[PDB]
């Protein structure tokens, strides 16, 4: 039974590119604050460079027929080819649109594609059309399909522009095939359980210290080390970690024991990694690979490994529960277990020892959506303001 | 049938020509400018191993682009639907505006023509119209501009006039000589002006109210239109159109600067020729609209009062018309239509008017001139 895309689901629009005779998968991305214009994020080299799907996920608000959309403008449903759909950026909360303003990227008959705050007007609405004759108008849209999107406002296709040296996204009369990948389904999401792509705090077994980086003493290189702190750090944004799965499709699925994932520090935008000297140190996105940045959750420190279980499509089954389940972090390749060094604002350093300590369990707590939004805003604004300061100093 | 055609054309962008395909395009203005040079060059225009033997490639490209623009402008929705706010009409007009920039249309209209000229022997050497730039090309431009982009800004109207229209009317007025009137270029330019350029200015008559500071350009437009009206080769329908346009613009025009055309009026009207119908109608409606400006000492507060130079001119006009009409033989429509003119002039003229002892000295000899009037 092939499952069908439905409204209120989180999806990512990905297009395949053919730069110098190789196929690399590119996902449509946007950033809420600052640049309204959309861009592309590469997902082919996930083993070498992590993909940032938090800015690529979109939600299917409403699927309406063309005449229903016209009547509404004059004033859980399965998507059908030829319907008018509304896409909201999950992070920003703003909707995709045709900006009606062009960057003049050598295409005079083109419009830039970006995010828009308001839902009124026909700029935000898009029409989905079948790729080939296998599908037809009025048919249900399958999770695995190629789609061409036509803007209602300008009758332009969501187009991948090869003309510029850098790959762009724009509304052009040429058509580009888009494939939809389901990230998560809200209705089938069990409450209180861990889902992929959640910003969360690692509460240590004492229930009063969190895994965090040093405070913002203006030393960016000093921010890289990882340790335990207790007190207000549990309320600050410097102890927020996002669990990113190694898979693009069905990333927002219930996390099972032993499933590899990457832990990203939201404030610094850096991934937790195990250096060869057994000491944890945050790496950059460019050099964050699967070899060092892969981690798993184990129910117990018992050495019988789960072997290999193939990832299953769909939302999956909920195993790890928030606030009560006890988890032990183990590096995938080295097999080391995360523990506190206990060397003596506790500032108790955390290292990985394959034997480990006895109270190495870590509970999981959800950060609020407001807290995650604010932390991402802080990271983006720090980056922009640092660039501005460097330019002014130059 | 218009929405379907527009959608098919936008789905197949190659139908718009290499200039407007978008990818590696130069624009409509650049395409027409390059077609100019193609027409100038013999090798690129012709095969080189009139029209049936030699297709003029520059004119072919020009006509293709003009036809595309004309078709799109005709595909533009009616203005009543846009006033009603119909979404499809709004969308179609927006698509057309995105397809064709306004600046390109203004530039193509600004492209000048090559006038026919007399030769040493006295023969009018006539450029081949089928070889180069023709007035119909700009006639399509105007239709697109007034059916898609719309002409509703006073500043934009003045800009368009100055850059592209007024030079064409000046060229027509210069070609209005009897020897050069018979030239086919003169006929085509007359058709272009009387069909596309001038009715547009007729429909844009209300916008002409706020032209006080741009007195020179509107005076030039008035004088060129009057000179074109004093043309031998103009057809009956063309004469009707020019009369209607001129009387429409004069009515909305500020009373002040139109004395620069009244000065030619006082010299041309007393002739009482067949050409004098439109002039005297213009006098009738202007004086009936601006009677209180002349008689009442203050006049309209915005308009002001007479400079007494206009008072003297109107005196000369009145008495010349009266004397000519008195010595003129009885013609039915002439005395039916002159009564309102003479009566309106008399009513506008203040009864207490001091006649100026200052006679004018050394008037514009172009005005006293009658063999070409220059």
Write the CA distances from A77 to A9, A61, A100, integer angstroms: 10, 10, 30
* Neighbouring residues of A322: CB distance < 8 A, sequence distance ≥ 6: A192, A193, A194, A364, A365, A366
Measured between CA atoms, the residue of chain A closest to residue B13 is A173
Instruction: Give Rg (Cα) of chain B.
Output: 24
**Which residues in chain B have Cβ-Cβ distances shorter than 8 Å to A106?**
23-24
Handedness of CA A296, A302, A305, A309 (dihedral sign): negative
Q: Which of A89, A95, A83, A53 is nearest to A147 (CA)?
A: A83
What secondary structure letter does DSSP report for A226?
-
Q: How far is B27 from chain A (nearest CA, A)?
A: 9
B27: how many CB neighbours lie within 10 A of its CB? Answer: 17
Question: Encoding tokens for residue A393?
Answer: 């100093």
**Which residues in chain A have Cβ-Cβ distances shorter than 8 Å to B10?**
155, 173
Say how many residues make up chain B: 374
Handedness of CA B53, B56, B60, B63 (dihedral sign): negative
For A88-109, letters b (16+ CB in 10 Å) and e give bbbbbebbbbbbbeeeebebbb
**Which residues in chain A have Cβ-Cβ distances shorter than 8 Å to B27?**
108
For B220-240, letters b (16+ CB in 10 Å) and e give bbbbbbbbbbbbeebeeebbe
**Which residues in chain A have Cβ-Cβ distances shorter than 8 Å to B87?**
70, 73-74, 122
Resolution in A: 3.2
**Cα end-to-end span (Å), chain B:** 52
Question: Could you tell me if B96 and B148 are in contact, meaning their C-beta atoms sit under 8 angstroms apart?
Answer: yes
B48 phi-psi bin (left φ>0, alpha ψ -120 to 50, beta other): left
Question: Could you tell me if A209 and A350 are in contact, meaning their C-beta atoms sit under 8 angstroms apart?
Answer: no
Q: Distance between CA atoms of B94 and A265, rounded to whole angstroms?
A: 46
Q: Phi/psi at B323 (nearest 5 deg)? A: -65, -45
**Which residues in chain A have Cβ-Cβ distances shorter than 8 Å to B84?**
none
**Which residues in chain A have Cβ-Cβ distances shorter than 8 Å to B11?**
173
Distance of CA B303 to the CA centre of its chain: 26
Across the interface, of B11, B13, B87, the residue whose CB is closest to A109 is B13
Q: How far is A173 from chain B (nearest CA, A)?
A: 6
Question: Encoding tokens for residue A204?
Answer: 């240590």
**Cα end-to-end span (Å), chain A:** 61
Across the interface, of B23, B25, B87, the residue whose CB is closest to A73 is B87
Measured between CA atoms, the residue of chain B closest to residue A105 is B23
Distance of CA A66 to the CA centre of its chain: 31
Residue B350 in contact with partner chain A when CB distance is under 8 A: no
C-alpha torsion B69→B72→B74→B79, nearest 10? -120
Measured between CA atoms, the residue of chain B closest to residue A74 is B87
Give A179's strand partners.
A14, A146
Question: Could you tell me if A135 and A81 are in contact, meaning their C-beta atoms sit under 8 angstroms apart?
Answer: yes
Question: Could you tell me if A297 and A255 are in contact, meaning their C-beta atoms sit under 8 angstroms apart?
Answer: yes
Measured between CA atoms, the residue of chain A closest to residue B11 is A173
Q: Distance between CA atoms of A295 and A289, rounded to whole angstroms?
A: 12
Q: Is A184 exposed, middle or buried (0-12, 13-18, 19+ CB in 10 A)?
A: buried
Q: Which of A116, A100, A111, A60 is nearest to A84 (CA)?
A: A60
Q: Phi/psi at B164 (nearest 5 deg)? A: -120, -30
What secondary structure letter does DSSP report for A36?
-
* Neighbouring residues of B62: CB distance < 8 A, sequence distance ≥ 6: B32, B35, B39, B132, B133, B134, B137
Q: Is B269 exposed, middle or buried (0-12, 13-18, 19+ CB in 10 A)?
A: buried
- Give the DSSP H or E segment for A165: none
Q: Distance between CA atoms of B255 and B292, rounded to whole angstroms?
A: 11
Question: Could you tell me if A42 and A26 are in contact, meaning their C-beta atoms sit under 8 angstroms apart?
Answer: yes
Question: Encoding tokens for residue A334?
Answer: 């080295």
Residue B95 in contact with partner chain A when CB distance is under 8 A: yes
User: Which single residue is written with the structure tokens 């117990």?
Assistant: A300
Q: Cβ of A122 and B87 within 8 Å?
A: yes
* Neighbouring residues of A136: CB distance < 8 A, sequence distance ≥ 6: A81, A130
Handedness of CA B28, B34, B40, B41 (dihedral sign): negative
Say how many residues make up chain A: 394
Residue of B6, B21, B22 to mutate for A, most A C-beta atoms under 10 A:
B22
Q: Cβ of A109 and B20 within 8 Å?
A: yes
């Amino acid at each position: 039974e092939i499952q069908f895309l439905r409204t209120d689901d989180e999806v990512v629009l990905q297009c395949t590119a053919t730069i110098h005779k190789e196929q690399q998968k590119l996902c449509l991305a946007a950033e809420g604050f600052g640049n309204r214009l959309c861009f592309l994020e590469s997902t082919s080299n996930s083993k070498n460079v992590p993909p940032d799907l938090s800015i690529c996920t979109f939600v299917l608000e409403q699927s309406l027929s063309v005449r229903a959309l016209q009547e509404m403008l004059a004033n859980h449903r399965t998507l059908l080819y030829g319907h008018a759909i509304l896409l909201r950026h999950s992070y920003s909360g703003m909707y995709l649109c045709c900006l009606s303003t062009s960057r003049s990227s050598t295409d005079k008959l083109a419009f830039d594609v970006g995010l828009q705050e308001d839902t009124t007007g026909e700029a935000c609405w898009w029409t989905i059309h079948p790729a080939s004759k296998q599908r037809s108008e009025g048919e249900k849209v399958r999770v695995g399909d190629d789609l061409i999107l036509v803007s209602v406002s300008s009758e332009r296709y969501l187009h991948l522009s090869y003309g510029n040296g850098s790959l762009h996204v724009d509304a052009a009369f040429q058509q580009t095939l888009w494939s939809v990948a389901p990230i998560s389904s809200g209705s089938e999401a069990a409450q209180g359980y861990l889902i992929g792509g959640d910003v969360l705090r690692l509460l240590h077994g004492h229930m009063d210290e969190c895994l965090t980086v040093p405070s913002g003493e203006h030393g960016e290189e000093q921010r890289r080390t990882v340790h335990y702190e207790g007190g207000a750090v549990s309320v600050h944004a410097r102890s927020l970690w996002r669990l990113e799965t190694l898979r693009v499709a069905w990333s927002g699925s219930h996390i099972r024991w032993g499933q590899p994932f990457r832990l990203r520090h939201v404030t610094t935008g850096k991934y937790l990694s195990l250096m060869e000297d057994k000491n944890l140190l945050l790496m950059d996105k460019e050099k964050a690979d699967v070899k060092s940045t892969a981690f798993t959750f184990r129910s117990s420190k018992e050495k019988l490994d789960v072997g290999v279980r193939k990832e299953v499509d769909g939302m999956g089954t909920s195993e790890i529960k928030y606030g009560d389940s006890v988890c032990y972090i183990q590096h995938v390749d080295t097999g080391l277990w995360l523990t506190y060094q206990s060397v003596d604002s506790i500032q108790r350093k955390a290292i990985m020892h394959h034997e480990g300590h006895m109270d190495d369990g870590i509970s999981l707590s959800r950060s609020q959506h407001e807290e995650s939004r604010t932390a991402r805003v802080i990271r983006s604004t720090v980056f922009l303001f640092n660039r501005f300061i460097r330019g002014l100093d130059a | 049938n218009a929405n379907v055609v527009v959608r098919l054309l936008i789905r197949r962008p190659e139908c718009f020509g290499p200039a407007l395909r978008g990818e590696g395009g130069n624009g409509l203005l650049a395409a027409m400018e390059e077609a100019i040079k193609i027409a100038e060059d013999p090798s690129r225009d012709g095969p080189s191993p009139e029209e049936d033997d030699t297709i003029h490639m520059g004119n072919a490209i020009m006509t293709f682009y003009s036809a595309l623009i004309d078709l799109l402008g005709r595909c533009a929705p009616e203005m009543h639907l846009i006033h009603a706010g119909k979404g499809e009409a709004i969308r179609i007009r927006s698509i057309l505006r995105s397809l064709i920039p306004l600046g390109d249309l203004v530039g193509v209209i600004s492209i000048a023509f090559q006038m026919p000229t007399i030769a040493k022997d006295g023969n009018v050497v006539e450029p081949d119209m089928s070889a180069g730039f023709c007035p119909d090309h700009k006639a399509a431009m105007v239709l697109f501009l007034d059916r898609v982009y719309g002409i509703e800004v006073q500043d934009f109207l003045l800009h368009l006039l100055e850059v592209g229209f007024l030079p064409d009317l000046r060229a027509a007025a210069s070609l209005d000589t009897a020897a050069l009137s018979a030239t086919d270029m003169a006929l085509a330019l007359n058709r272009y002006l009387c069909t596309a350029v001038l009715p547009l200015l007729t429909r844009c008559a209300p916008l002409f109210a706020g032209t006080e500071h741009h007195a020179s350009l509107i005076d030039s437009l008035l004088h060129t239109v009057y000179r074109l009206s004093k043309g031998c080769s103009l057809t009956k329908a063309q004469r009707d159109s020019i009369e209607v346009c001129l009387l429409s613009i004069c009515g909305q025009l500020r009373p002040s600067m139109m004395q620069h055309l009244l000065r030619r009026l006082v010299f041309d009207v007393p002739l009482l020729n067949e050409h004098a119908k439109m002039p005297l109608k213009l006098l009738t409606n202007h004086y009936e609209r601006c009677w209180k400006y002349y008689c009442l000492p203050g006049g309209w507060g915005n308009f002001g009062a007479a400079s007494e130079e206009e008072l003297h001119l109107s005196r000369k006009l009145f008495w010349g018309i009266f004397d000519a009409l008195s010595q003129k033989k009885y013609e039915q429509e002439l005395f039916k239509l002159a009564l309102p003119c003479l009566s309106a002039v008399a009513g506008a003229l203040p009864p207490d008017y001091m006649e100026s002892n200052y006679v004018s000295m050394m008037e514009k000899q172009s005005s006293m001139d009658s063999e070409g009037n220059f």
